From a paper:
PB1 domains are protein interaction modules with critical roles in the assembly of protein complexes involved in autophagy, signaling, cell division, and redox processes, as well as the auxin-response pathway in plants. PB1 domains form homotypic interactions via conserved electrostatic motifs molded by basic or acidic surface patches on opposite faces of their ubiquitin-like β-grasp fold. While type A and type B PB1 domains can form heterodimeric protein complexes, type AB members can mediate interactions with either PB1 domain type or engage in homotypic interactions to form homo-oligomers or hetero-oligomers. Our cryo-EM structures of filamentous p62 and AtNBR1–PB1 assemblies revealed that the presence of a tandem arginine sequence in the basic motif of type AB interfaces is required to stabilize a polymeric assembly.
In the absence of prior structural information, we traced the AtNBR1–PB1 de novo. This de novo-built model is in close agreement with the 1.6-Å crystal structure of a polymerization-deficient AtNBR1–PB1 mutant, which we solved in parallel. To validate our structural interpretation, we performed pull-down experiments using MBP-tagged wild-type AtNBR1–PB1 as a prey and a series of AtNBR1–PB1 interface mutants as bait. All interface mutants decrease binding significantly compared with the wild type, and binding is completely abrogated in mutants lacking the double arginine finger, in agreement with observations in cellular assays.
Author numbering: 5 to 92
Amino acid sequence: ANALVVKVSYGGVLRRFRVPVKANGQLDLEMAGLKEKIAALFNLSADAELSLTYSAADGAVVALVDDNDLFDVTNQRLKFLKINVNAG
Ligand SMILES: [Cl-]
């Protein structure tokens, strides 16, 4: 009953929304719904091949390319996610 805060950066612009979690701690969101939300926020195509990345605590970048990557945001008990969006 505690949501994940997601910040998304695109074009020098930061936007915030919150994503509900299930009792599992699993996000109530999949990659399609994430892309649709980001598309609505920045007037992009929801089916564009967007690079969605975040910087992990070990200094390595994580690319969100499938639902397993999003499942692992919760598995890792992150409470804040900052996603950088790049197009092309
Ligand atoms: Cl902020």
